[PDB]
Amino acid sequence: MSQLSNQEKEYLISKALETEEGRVALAQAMANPIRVSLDYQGVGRKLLVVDPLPQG
Amino acid sequence: PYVRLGYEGILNGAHDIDVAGLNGVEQLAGKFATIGANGVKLAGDNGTNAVGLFREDLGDMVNASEKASFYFRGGEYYVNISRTSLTAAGIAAGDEITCDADGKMIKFTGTGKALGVVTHVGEYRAGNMYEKATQGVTDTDTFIGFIMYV
Amino acid sequence: PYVRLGYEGILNGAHDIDVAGLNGVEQLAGKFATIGANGVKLAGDNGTNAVGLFREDLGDMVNASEKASFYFRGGEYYVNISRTSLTAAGIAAGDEITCDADGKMIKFTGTGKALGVVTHVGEYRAGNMYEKATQGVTDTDTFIGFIMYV
Amino acid sequence: PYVRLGYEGILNGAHDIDVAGLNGVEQLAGKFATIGANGVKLAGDNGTNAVGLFREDLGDMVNASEKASFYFRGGEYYVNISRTSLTAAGIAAGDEITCDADGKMIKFTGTGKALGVVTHVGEYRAGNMYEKATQGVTDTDTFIGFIMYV
Amino acid sequence: PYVRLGYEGILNGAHDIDVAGLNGVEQLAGKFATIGANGVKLAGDNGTNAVGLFREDLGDMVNASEKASFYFRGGEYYVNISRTSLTAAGIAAGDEITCDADGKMIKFTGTGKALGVVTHVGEYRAGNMYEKATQGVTDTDTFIGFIMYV
Amino acid sequence: VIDRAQQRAKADIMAVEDAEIFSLLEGAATAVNAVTISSGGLQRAALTKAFQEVEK
Amino acid sequence: VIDRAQQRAKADIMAVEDAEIFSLLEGAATAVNAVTISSGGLQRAALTKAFQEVEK
Numbered sequence A: 001m002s003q004l005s006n007q008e009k010e011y012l013i014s015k016a017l018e019t020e021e022g023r024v025a026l027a028q029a030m031a032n033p034i035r036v037s038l039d040y041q042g043v044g045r046k047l048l049v050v051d052p053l054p055q056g
Numbered sequence B, C, D, E: 001p002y003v004r005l006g007y008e009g010i011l012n013g014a015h016d017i018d019v020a021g022l023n024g025v026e027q028l029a030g031k032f033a034t035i036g037a038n039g040v041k042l043a044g045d046n047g048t049n050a051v052g053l054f055r056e057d058l059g060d061m062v063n064a065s066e067k068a069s070f071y072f073r074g075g076e077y078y079v080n081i082s083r084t085s086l087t088a089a090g091i092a093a094g095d096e097i098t099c100d101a102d103g104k105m106i107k108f109t110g111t112g113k114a115l116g117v118v119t120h121v122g123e124y125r126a127g128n129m130y131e132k133a134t135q136g137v138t139d140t141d142t143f144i145g146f147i148m149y150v
Numbered sequence F, G: 001v002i003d004r005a006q007q008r009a010k011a012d013i014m015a016v017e018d019a020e021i022f023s024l025l026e027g028a029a030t031a032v033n034a035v036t037i038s039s040g041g042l043q044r045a046a047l048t049k050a051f052q053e054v055e056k
Helices: F001-008 F039-054 G002-009 G038-046 G050-054
Strands: B032-033 B104-105 B148-149 C029-032 C052-055 C062-064 C096-098 C105-107 C147-149 D055-056 D060-066 D116-118 D123-124 E054-056 E061-064 E114-120 E125-127
Touching: none
Parallel strands: none
Antiparallel strands: B104 B148, C029 C096, C052 C062, C105 C147, D055 D060, D116 D123, E054 E061, E114 E125
């Protein structure tokens, strides 16, 4: 209450400070920094991988 | 000494909104019921409204009054079809409300004709603009907490 | 364009722009009447048209429609319909008169499609609107004499 | 998506969806897009398409969503289906419009998933804005991560 | 193969499903395709090949195979195991596929909708035969992403 | 100083005072609770949980 | 960055765009990490497991 005699206003305002400075915090769910990155030249990748080796 | 007016300290009872006129049916293009008209729960101005009348300021939420009275738009002043408000904040049932637009009895607030500006207690008073659009009953001088048929 | 001399007639209803009660979307914002135009009775006493097309001004005054047979720009159809179901009333000298917009049923004629009521001044129904697209099915079970929702 | 490339260009809505005679505030009921004048098209002319969010005005009129540094108006926000246009989802302004929450699919800036709001400059965007209120119901068809009808 | 009974995205009939032997081989869990549909594409042509004609390679790899310029097999050319495609290009709807021989249903694609032709873009296409070979025993009747029997 | 903290969190408002911050904020995080784990443990367990959230 | 993470981890077997763990994976034996009824025990057990493959 802005009176001692009882009345309120709620929509009439002045001297705003820290308006539109809110956020919504987001939990980490990255994988890009967790693998290694290197620059490369080419327009596609060819990869070779080894399969199960014989044993016994 | 010391007397509250509006803001949930006045009791305006309850009134029936399915009384007078044609009565539509339950459908969408409604809006939400809360205290505050752009506010949040437990923070809202309030007229002498009970059941009937509530005007959006920001968002698609309603509670009583608040919106320039030079131009009323949205399809009527919004009325309730087949739920009767159980608060005296004007509307603030806490549900999504399906609204209508048939002729339907309302509760008014503020002295004199609405054709003015908004008082930030939840009322209409005369502004610098005159011969602006009125609400409900015409030809008849309206006062604070009159019962109008739209 | 600019047609309709004097008062409106009585033909297949003629109140709530032909019989139907208070349905559709409404507003019912009253506001004062200036003298009509574009039929007879331009000045002095009663107006032009008695339940036909009326048009809102930009100071929130109401008079006979000043607009006719414009194409390729937006809609706008305003009628002056009083508060009570099955009553509609026209402009007079002075006094606050409650107006409405469409959301009433009208009567169509022809085999075309109504996309609304006549572009020109006056009338309380759609004509045979060749002045609007015939294209696509707008209001189901289209035939001559059928009651169309505007 | 099918052999030799998936979807591209505009994609077909539902045509001739006719909704009429409603008692409430919905945009579904045959009613106008108004900017001012007298509506569009001659006989045998076919509409265009326009997607975005529209807002109900005074009487039984709709117009485009603008700002948020001005008042929120009318019920739910909706996107336009066809019933005069023979082409896709959409309508040309100054017709009777049925809207839906389906507008599939004409691209325009951002997306419409989980309700839509109006931004503070007047673009159309998706939720969630308020979590304490219910905004215009436009629940879009699956089409995400790519430009689309809001 | 050589029995007329085609039609379907997956028939359970004979020479339409293998699971070891029977003019083609199937693994008991598949191998994943690094060319063609394997996971769900929502666009893209996925490289060359969309008409079948793959070879399974060592470990969990499926890879390219194709026909030299100016030739067509008189024998049975490779096709995949018969799948639907909810994906742009590939035969698979994001499944892990194995290679077979003739007797399995594929999707064809192109600019025609008459009998099959041979292209040396490493695909076969829909054309009209006149000097270029047709594809499948029930020819090519494709409307793009129709299930044709090989 | 005491009364101010009470109204601000929540302590019964009559729609005449500042909003009830404690109500509006994030519900109970079931994840923290390892099922039949000590109360003191809960307070330790929660502190880390806010760091995962990316809130100071 | 996230969309990259989202493919990279999971997408109904992918290796026509971003190689993902699940497509690539061979073997996996829960028995080696023992069996536990506490989230922590599995996590303690887990750190060691990469060392068996001959990966640090």
